[PDB]
Amino acid sequence: HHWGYGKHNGPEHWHKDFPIAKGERQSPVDIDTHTAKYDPSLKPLSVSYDQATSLRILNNGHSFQVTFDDSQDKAVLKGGPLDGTYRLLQFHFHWGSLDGQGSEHTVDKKKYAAELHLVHWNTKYGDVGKAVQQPDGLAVLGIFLKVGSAKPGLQKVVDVLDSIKTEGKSADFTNFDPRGLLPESLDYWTYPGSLTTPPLAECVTWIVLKEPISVSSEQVLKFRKLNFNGEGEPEELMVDNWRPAQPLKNRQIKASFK
């Protein structure tokens, strides 16, 4: 009985109640490698996750999310296009009903099997609730998933999804090191955008890594066995929880690499 990814409530309908859906800095977008230009002014990007403290994993009926203790500069993201310090709040994924789709961003119109989002907030604004009201309030680090060999860093996640099958279910989820989900290269594209779900707020600097991570066909299949619904409600399997690419309009996608 609210927005989702179904026949009634999915991305094609969100504009009926979230008019910013047709706005001037919406996400995701297609990243055209012929027009996304190298920017020599981009400063080095610093992913600092060695102090990350994971807390819980939750199925909220839109995705599953892993939360972190962001109460001090534990896990942070700095540099790149960003000014100051952004703290890691949570991560979650978007994925498809089959391997040939599921990512939100695309590259030369190619869809990946899934996309990982590491959500960070700008400490200049003091807290998340203030940050999300500002155009530079959040930075989301996006990582593509392709099907290949199994990803060891995803094992802990895969092993607990059966315990959070339905909407509202959560589990303790400590000592998860998000570095295991990063590719070797931190080469990236960046542009100003929005949340890719309602409320679609235009408060995000996107940093999308060029190198995908490979996960096994079984690992991404396990994401597809989660339920959008709650316990006792009839089953609706959690798949195709991605928004398609939106018009770039008056924005430039910058590459960190030549």
Q: Considering only CA atoms, which of 187, 215, 21 is closest in space to residue 115?
A: 215
Positions in 73-132 near Zn ion (CB under 5 A): 117
Q: DSSP 3-state assignment of 129?
A: helix
Of 2 and 109, the one with the shorter C-beta distance to Zn ion is 2
Site string for Zn ion, 33-62 (x = CB under 5 A): ------------------------------
Which residues are annotated as catalytic? 62
Residues 92 and 115: their CA atoms lie apart, in Å, by 9
Of 91 and 125, the one with the shorter C-beta distance to Zn ion is 91
Q: Is 92 annotated as a binding residue?
A: yes
Q: Considering only CA atoms, which of 95, 82, 193, 200 is closest in space to residue 143?
A: 95
Q: 78 — phi, psi (to 5°)?
A: -135, 170
Positions in 151-170 near Zn ion (CB under 5 A): none
Of 28 and 81, the one with the shorter C-beta distance to Zn ion is 28
Q: Is 15 annotated as a binding residue?
A: no
Q: Which residue is nearest to Zn ion (CB)?
A: 117
User: Letter for the amino acid at 193?
Assistant: G
**Least distance in angstroms from the C-beta of 27 to Zn ion:** 9
**Least distance in angstroms from the C-beta of 26 to Zn ion:** 13
Q: Is 123 annotated as a binding residue?
A: no
Q: 């996750």: which residue's tokens?
A: 49
Residues 35 and 254: their CA atoms lie apart, in Å, by 9
Spatial neighbors of 240 by CB under 8 A, at least 6 apart, are 5, 95, 96, 97, 101, 102
Of 117 and 254, the one with the shorter C-beta distance to Zn ion is 117
Q: Is 117 annotated as a binding residue?
A: yes
Q: Is 85 annotated as a binding residue?
A: no
What's the helix, strand, coil split of the chain in %, to 5? Answer: 15, 30, 55
**Least distance in angstroms from the C-beta of 8 to Zn ion:** 12
Known binding residues for substrate are: 196-197
Binding interface with Zn ion (CB under 5 A): 117
Binding site, annotated residues for Zn(2+): 92, 94, 117
